């Protein structure tokens, strides 16, 4: 029957005996336990050590293991992805299904797991009531079995299953057999850009519940005004045998403190001409001036439900934490409260690189602490349900959650092709209308989701309307077929450019400025998804920020996304390294492109996460004169843990500070006025900078976490007082190869065939490894890339257009090399031109001036044809043969920063050691450039003037032919780019060019200045 | 497996191996054949004898069933009802499920009727292409197997379930077995309160179509704003190997004349980032000027729809009937191509006395003749989707269609218990989808039904967002949680009243007067059932066309219903009788509730029909003088097959007649002045008729058909001349037992102890068989008993009332009786007391008074209680000794009419045999009243006055004490009722007091006379 059935390739089977969908449950037999959240003996864990073994299909299965333990199969930690044990190979795919498209059916291979568990139920929970298995999360889907006897199957890998185990099991010892098959009917619903992996991968836990149950239960919460009054409405549910004596009590708890409650027999108000829910009873409880949930201050009640008798007898407790909240939209802005929402989001997908999607408490606070210490309030579930703690966490530390059902078909032929079919309807509204049963208790869901990449059809307008019928307290978004279509209450594009249309047939993406106001459109914009931060990224991103803070309707938005889905690998001596696309042999894969975190895998931050947390600040300052303008961006709270601490230095050396408490209401002002300040005798830049400092730990954060900063130029006063004239002179050796400049123990040599710096000496230590060349390429990064292949072509990335204009081959001709003595210097004039295939792309002319001082300044004036694509950079490098262990700078860092992405960078005079000034993406790319650079030191060696700047022990050529970081060598010595000028990131998105005009290297001519000294 | 999985309790499985639905399809491989609708040699009946075995159960159905045929098995007409072969019982409930409710779980003692048929296939159909089976009807779920091997599962007993016999097969014989259950999860969304019968009771059919195939096209007309100009749009889909070769043809006739043509290759529009559909195609046809279609003008087009080759060969042709019309709600009205609808239109469930719910195409066409002639315009489906030459018959007559799906959960508690659980979306979707699916092309559907009787629950919400979504042509009506909820375009009310609301909790029932202008209301009203039809009925009809006809967004409604659900037994003598509920042993029932017709089964007409014809008149009538204003309601037709007669008589003697053409457009009037009319020399009330006559045949009506007519009461002169006295004077002879009148042959004799006429002679010849006694009850109508049991008394009901009252057992109490001599007259003066426990109910006074011309004139003054409940009726009663072939009387006729329902009776003389003076409602009651009657003609005897009569062979008493007409006997003599005052019958529902205030008998005194005399 079960493999002749083959439910797994039949949509319009979803289930076999599945319970109904509800809230979470513990059945607590004692009150205070439920008040309190203490665990339930009713509720059993078996997240244990399962039997486990693996098939090639469903039909390899022998029938000896629905009674007994197989031989052949191990002992294996659950929840857990059987991939992430090596029983077969976790797939990387984006787009394209896994699986060869052709609905319903999947391979005869399917990857079958068998788990099983022996395990003891005591006789008091047979005797009486109802004894449930609950599988929170089973990819992707199962039949089951207990004691050799077929209990049911199910679907959906990211909603609980729950089957009633009561007449199944015996007093003693039983042994569950779950089958599960890695391809199904419902892995069609399940495309998401993320490993396609399998198994029993999220709790596992028996339920005991009495006879006569609540089986249901909805908390709502309604206001006056000005949310002074609220009204928490709670309708419960029961199955069993209604009886007069039957009673329902909700008592509502702030704290310690019982604030309401309510009792009523069952029996609900007249709904038809058939009467009522005899089953169902609604308690209304008034609470005056109840303490508001947000995000900036998560206030919590406790509800606790009971069933009882009219005498005092418990049966049974359920309860949820509850947050008095409004969620609406009017007039085209999302409010909460009755204030508008900005959305400072993120996406987040469930992954963990040791356990894949299996998910721990302690990963996701991790994550939501670290959130929140960024300026985030909100997550959207991209693009599933959550494991069930990921919601009371968001709960209770306050973030905002985008609640999204497990739908997904972006590799059908057209995207809409099963969602527009009413053959599917059935299969979609169970991922849609189960997570609403399961989740609307939860007051940080405040926005349902339809799924994600599906197209627009028929199924999406039927489940948002079902949606919007069942619950009216929570706006419905979807982005498919357009992002504004009818199945939608916001506007929620994926990767819309704040400025830039991008008019695609059918489903352009507008500029989100130009898309507010299209003739008739009035709804908010919140981008789904924006700022695709894969490796190197995040260019652009205060361009989003400016224009969510002006425009009213732009509420914000979600960043893709939180975390890299890279995965750990071992190699021979069991060094772990990050494996993305490609790397278990799974193909077609689609390589670094599961890598798009502001974190790595392991949570370390990438640079771009900085630039997040700035743009994201809560506090907005302006500088008039002497005063310092705070304004705040809170809706509820006021600056009740927030000092100002500002500084004002000359190129780094502080010459005043202090600090000020912020007294700032919610969108309110304050004024502070600095002090007047002493005016520097030394020339040179005074910098301001303020720092908002939370003087106490909370929750989320501890004491003196700095939460915002800006800065700001002040006076400078220009150096007019010549260098005293040193005595010495250089003298100028020549020869028919070379240029040779000495200063008493130093040495300058140009070659006269190249026309470059090839040597410089320090009485006899060589200072050069390689010439002192211009360079107009950098090792691209995942954005120059894009979905370019070595099979496929992409001709309008910009690593093809540099490929194509011979970039990366251009060749150095000498047009002029020249040596001239001055009265106090040597003047050394070069010009070469970059040819390739007999075309000229580059012109650089230079001067180097040495003189008593033994200070080389380097003038270099660059032509870059207009018809060639813009360059990567305009610079230097060399090979230093020196290796120094810090680095000092006086200008932005301290993280790297790119002129697309420098916000967040703060002037000063910053010092790390030299492996901090490499960035260690996992796909490497040009990396750790600083930005406007006036003096860096390096071992012996100083370069002042304005400049950007990296270096490392890698050169651009190794970073550019090195797939994995783990494989990149420490080359002799040091490498040093330093860029007059250098192109931005972009970030956008991925996947088309997405560096803005304005940072491209478009001038067409370009000059720069460089003093090389020895300090 | 089939036995073992039990898919007929599970509401998940609505399905297995079943293919999509679609438009009606016929395999044309000639494009000729196609145009014109010709049978199609792909498309073959398998409407024959079957073979055919009931079971108890499907346990009990042998294995060898499968392979072979059961020698047991009866042969039998396929499509049938089994109950009609007797195979078991009918069931009629109405709202009471026939299964206990336990969903979804069926009793295991479920019927189960095993059909079979052998059968040839010629070897064409299986050496290409691809063989499906269709059956339209199956009820109420079936398992299908061919050849002993299983193909397929079914549910929803009222659209095609369609299922691939291409791999099952063989060229020559072949065998089908279908086994079919009575009951399943199905049957809980088919709680229609009809009979509850089973078995395959729509045809059953092969279908060929080639491999590469038209699989599904939907057309659509979108018009200018004057439709003078059209686009006909038509998506074709495509299933099988894509070859770029391939095109789609659509062309579009106008009878024998293309008017349009359009070719293209498959490849649709770019629909969303992953492209669009490469199998479909999207037509646009021009058409200038196109011939609307309404009920008015049913104009129709053909569509042709040819998938080719390049090279132009025909792989296969489908089509359909064009209505070029547009639906829509526009500032509140229902609009059809501009114009405001008003639907005269009746509920029509599919029902046959012979066959049950097998449908053929002579009776439909009986049916849709029968209501136009009636002045019908629409029809809703009540309360499933139809048998599909429905649709096509009022494509082609113009009939405005309700299409609804088969969802009905009325005897649910709540009634949306099911309909607002997402575990029966799916079943649910399934049975809106695939209607849609399958009837979307037809013009004569306007509205689509989400079902009926079902409550509100959230799953009519996604259904109703659903239809608008895929068809936006056609507004979406549900009546279920009040009739006006968020699943409705259209306010659509069943049995609310026009004037009196009903003020029920939740779900009240507003006068539909009230409900237009409600605060916030804006929709349109249109009654989904009102004027319950239920035995004699249709009382107040007059006052709801009134409304219709004054409110613009009160724009009609459905008249509940068209046709008695009685079924044919036969007794003793083989002779057949009219069946309701219980007479097949089936309990619960609710007896003659099934019989609710405006016809009789047979579709003989009830004398309600002759009221809506009336008042759904077409063409409406002012006199002002001379003049007769005409106004036509036709919103599209002029009057081009109409003339108007005219008549006016002097109590029934014609005076002068006459023709006028009749030249109005639509919306238009015309003005008729009447010549110049002679004054009447005699006594008596000039009356004008206007009759609106055919000339011509139509498709649906006979040349002479009269489709309007009016009266008026024109000059009466009044008789002041005094009759010539008789010579003859009467002599009274007084006995202590008896008053004795003689007057030559004749003699009047009133018994002095009961104080009432107990005989009347002529010569010799007696012609009293009872007392001329005082009347003041009526053998119950329906309306009257309403849904009142002897084990459940509803006191609420008028028989109730009158029984509680002691009206049925009030004995008359002799007062007074005296008689008198006057100078020319015998007076005999009477008082009698009616009086229940000591109480005076009713107090009669009357004068009989006897002059020398045999005249007896009766004076009758009544007094009523004002306490007691109103009076039936107040009038006298006698049985007559003669038994006359005729019956002649001048008054209102020809046909029953009450005082609520009297507007289509006319004002004449009238003359019948007497056995069309009886009304044969299967539930004998009161019947057959003629009111507004001066005179009144039987055998010797004349009655003159101004009273309502109705005469019979049938005592009140015997029709009150029998349950079935085919029981009545005709009794001695003749039974006369004479009412100077009737109460009107109601009949706005059938289960609650319906008879307005203006026609109970609450004055508390009446007065009327009589003359009595022999013509
Ligand atoms: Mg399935
Ligand atoms: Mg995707
Ligand atoms: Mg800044
Ligand atoms: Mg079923
Ligand atoms: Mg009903
Ligand atoms: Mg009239
Ligand atoms: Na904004
Ligand atoms: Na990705
Ligand atoms: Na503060
Ligand atoms: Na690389
Ligand atoms: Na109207
Ligand atoms: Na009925
Ligand atoms: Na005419
Ligand atoms: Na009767």
Same mark, same amino acid.
């Given at each position: 029957?079960?493999?002749q ?19 979470p ?7 205070e336990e439920?008040?309190t959240?203490?665990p339930?003996?009713?509720?059993r ?5 399962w ?10 299965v ?7 333990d197989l ?12 991939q ?12 394209t ?7 319903p ?7 079958t797991?068998?788990?099983?568990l ?24 199962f ?26 099991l ?19 619903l399940?495309?998401q ?5 399998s ?7 028996? $339920?005991?519940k009495?006879?006569?149950?609540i089986?249901d ?5 309604? =206001? ?7 009204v928490l409405?709670?309708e ?5 045998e ?8 909700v008592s509502l708890?702030?704290?310690?403190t019982?604030?309401a409650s309510?009792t009523?027999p069952?029996?609900?108000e ?15 409880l008034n ?18 439900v009971?069933?009882?008798?009219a ?5 049974e407790?359920?309860?949820c934490?509850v947050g008095f909240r ?30 894949g ?10 994550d ?7 300026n ?12 069930? !703690? ?8 306050? !973030?905002?959650?985008?609640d ?5 078909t ?11 079919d009413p ?5 979609m ?8 049963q399961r ?6 869901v405040?926005?349902?989701? $339809?799924?994600n990449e599906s ?15 069942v619950?009216p307290?929570?706006?419905v ?7 504004d279509?009818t ?17 695609f ?6 500029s ?27 260019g ?28 750990i ?28 975190? $502001?974190?790595f895998?392991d ?16 506090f907005?300052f302006?500088?008039s ?7 705040s961006?809170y ?31 919610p ?11 002493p ?20 929750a ?8 915002a ?19 010495a002179?250089?003298?100028?050796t020549?020869?028919?190869?070379? =240029? ?6 130093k040495?300058w ?26 360079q ?10 894009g ?19 011979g ?11 020249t ?9 050394i004039?070069?010009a070469h031109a ?5 075309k000229? $792309? ?21 032509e870059?044809?207009?018809?060639t694509?813009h ?19 006086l200008?932005?860092?301290?993280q790297?920063?790119?002129?697309d992405?420098?916000?967040a960078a703060?002037?000063?005079?910053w010092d ?10 996992? =796909? ?11 003096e860096?030191?390096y071992?012996?060696?100083?370069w ?15 970073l550019?032919?090195?797939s ?27 996947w ?22 020895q300090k």
């Amino acid at each position: 029957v079960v493999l002749q059935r083959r439910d797994w390739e039949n949509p319009g089977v979803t289930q076999l005996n599945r319970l109904a969908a509800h809230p979470p449950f513990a059945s607590w037999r004692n009150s205070e336990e439920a008040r309190t959240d203490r665990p339930s003996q009713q509720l059993r864990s078996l997240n244990g050590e399962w039997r486990f073994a693996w098939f090639p299909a469903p039909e390899a299965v022998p029938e000896s293991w629905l009674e007994c333990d197989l031989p052949e199969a191990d002992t294996v930690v659950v929840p857990s992805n059987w991939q992430m044990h090596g029983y077969d190979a976790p797939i990387y795919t984006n787009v394209t299904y896994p699986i060869t498209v052709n609905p319903p059916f999947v391979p005869t291979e399917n990857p079958t797991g068998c788990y099983s568990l022996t395990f003891n139920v005591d006789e008091s929970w047979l005797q009486e009531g109802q004894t449930r298995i609950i599988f929170d999360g089973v990819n992707s889907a199962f039949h089951l079995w207990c004691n050799g006897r077929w209990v049911g199957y199910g679907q959906d890998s990211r909603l609980p299953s729950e089957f009633d185990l009561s007449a199944f099991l015996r007093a003693g010892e039983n042994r569950l057999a779950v089958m599960v098959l890695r391809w199904s009917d419902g892995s069609y619903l399940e495309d998401q850009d993320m490993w396609r992996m399998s198994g029993i991968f999220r709790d596992v836990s028996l $339920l005991h519940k009495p006879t006569t149950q609540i089986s249901d239960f909805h908390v709502a919460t309604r =206001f006056n005004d000005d949310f002074s009054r609220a009204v928490l409405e709670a309708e419960v549910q029961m199955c069993g045998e209604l009886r007069d004596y039957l009673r329902v009590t909700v008592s509502l708890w702030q704290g310690e403190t019982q604030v309401a409650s309510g009792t009523a027999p069952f029996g609900g108000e007249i709904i038809d001409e058939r009467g009522g829910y005899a089953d169902r009873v609604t308690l209304r409880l008034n609470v005056e001036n109840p303490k508001l949930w947000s995000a900036e201050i998560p206030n919590l009640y406790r509800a606790v439900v009971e069933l009882h008798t009219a005498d005092g007898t418990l049966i049974e407790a359920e309860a949820c934490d509850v947050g008095f909240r409004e969620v609406r939209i009017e007039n085209g802005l999302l409010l909460l409260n009755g204030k508008p929402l900005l959305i400072r989001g993120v996406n987040r997908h469930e992954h963990h690189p040791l356990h894949g999607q299996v998910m721990d408490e302690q990963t996701m606070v991790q994550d939501i602490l670290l959130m929140k210490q960024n300026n985030f309030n909100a997550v959207r579930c991209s693009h599933y349900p959550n494991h069930p !703690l990921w919601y009371t966490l968001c709960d209770r530390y306050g !973030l905002y959650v985008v609640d999204e059902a497990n739908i997904e078909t972006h590799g059908m032929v057209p995207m809409n092709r099963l969602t527009d079919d009413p053959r599917w309807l059935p299969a979609m509204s169970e991922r849609v209308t189960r997570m609403v049963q399961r989740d609307r208790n939860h007051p940080s869901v405040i926005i349902w989701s $339809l799924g994600n990449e599906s197209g627009h059809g028929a199924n999406h307008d039927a489940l948002y309307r079902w949606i919007k019928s069942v619950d009216p307290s929570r706006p419905v978004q979807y982005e498919g077929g357009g992002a504004d279509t009818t199945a939608t209450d916001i506007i929620c594009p994926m990767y819309a450019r704040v400025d830039e249309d991008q008019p695609f047939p059918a489903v352009p993406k507008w500029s989100i400025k130009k898309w507010l106001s299209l003739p008739g459109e009035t709804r908010p914009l919140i981008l789904c998804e924006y700022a695709h931060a894969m490796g190197n990224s995040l260019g652009g991103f205060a361009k989003y920020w400016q224009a969510f803070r002006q425009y009213p309707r732009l509420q914000g938005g979600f960043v893709w996304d939180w975390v890299d889905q890279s995965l750990i690998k071992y190699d021979e001596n069991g060094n772990p390294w990050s494996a993305y696309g490609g790397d278990f042999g799974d193909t077609p894969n689609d390589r670094q492109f599961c890598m798009n975190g $502001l974190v790595f895998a392991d949570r370390t931050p990438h640079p771009a996460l900085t630039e997040a947390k700035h743009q994201q600040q809560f506090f907005q300052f302006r500088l008039s004169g002497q005063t310092i303008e705070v304004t705040s961006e809170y809706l509820f709270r006021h600056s009740d843990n927030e000092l100002l601490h500002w500084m004002v230095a000359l190129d780094g050396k502080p010459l005043a500070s202090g600090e000020v408490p912020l007294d700032v209401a919610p969108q309110g002002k304050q004024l502070i006025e600095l002090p007047e300040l002493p005016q520097p005798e030394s020339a040179g830049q005074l910098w301001l900078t303020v720092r908002v400092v939370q003087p106490n730990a909370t929750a989320w954060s501890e004491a003196g976490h700095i939460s915002a900063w800006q800065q700001w130029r002040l006076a400078e006063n220009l150096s007019v007082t010549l260098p005293a004239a040193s005595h010495a002179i250089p003298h100028l050796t020549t020869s028919e190869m070379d =240029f040779c400049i000495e200063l008493g123990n130093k040495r300058w040599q140009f070659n006269r065939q190249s026309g470059f710096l090839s040597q410089m000496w320090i009485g006899d230590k060589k200072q050069l490894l390689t010439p002192l060349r211009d360079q107009f390429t950098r090792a691209p990064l995942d954005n120059d890339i894009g979905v370019t292949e070595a099979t496929r072509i992409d001709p309008n990335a910009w690593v093809e257009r540099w490929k194509a204009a011979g970039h990366y081959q251009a060749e150095a001709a000498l047009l002029q090399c020249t040596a001239d003595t001055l009265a106090d210097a040597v003047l050394i004039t070069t010009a070469h031109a970059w040819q390739h295939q007999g075309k000229t $792309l580059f012109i650089s002319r230079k001067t180097y001036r040495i003189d008593g001082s033994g200070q080389m300044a380097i003038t270099v004036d660059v032509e870059v044809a207009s018809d060639t694509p813009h360059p990567a950079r305009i610079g230097l490098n060399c090979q230093l043969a020196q290796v120094a262990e810090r680095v000092n700078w006086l200008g932005l860092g301290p993280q790297e920063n790119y002129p697309d992405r420098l916000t967040a960078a703060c002037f000063d005079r910053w010092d790390l050691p030299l492996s901090d000034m490499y960035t260690p993406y996992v =796909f490497p790319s040009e990396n750790g450039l600083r930005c406007g650079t006036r003096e860096l030191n390096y071992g012996p060696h100083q370069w002042r003037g304005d400049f950007q700047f990296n270096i490392s022990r890698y050169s651009q050529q190794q970073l550019m032919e090195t797939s994995h970081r783990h494989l990149l060598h420490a080359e002799e010595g040091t490498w040093l780019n330093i860029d007059g000028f250098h192109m931005g990131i972009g970030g956008d998105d991925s996947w088309s060019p997405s560096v803005s005009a304005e940072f491209q290297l478009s001038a067409g001519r370009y000059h720069y200045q460089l003093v090389w000294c020895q300090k």
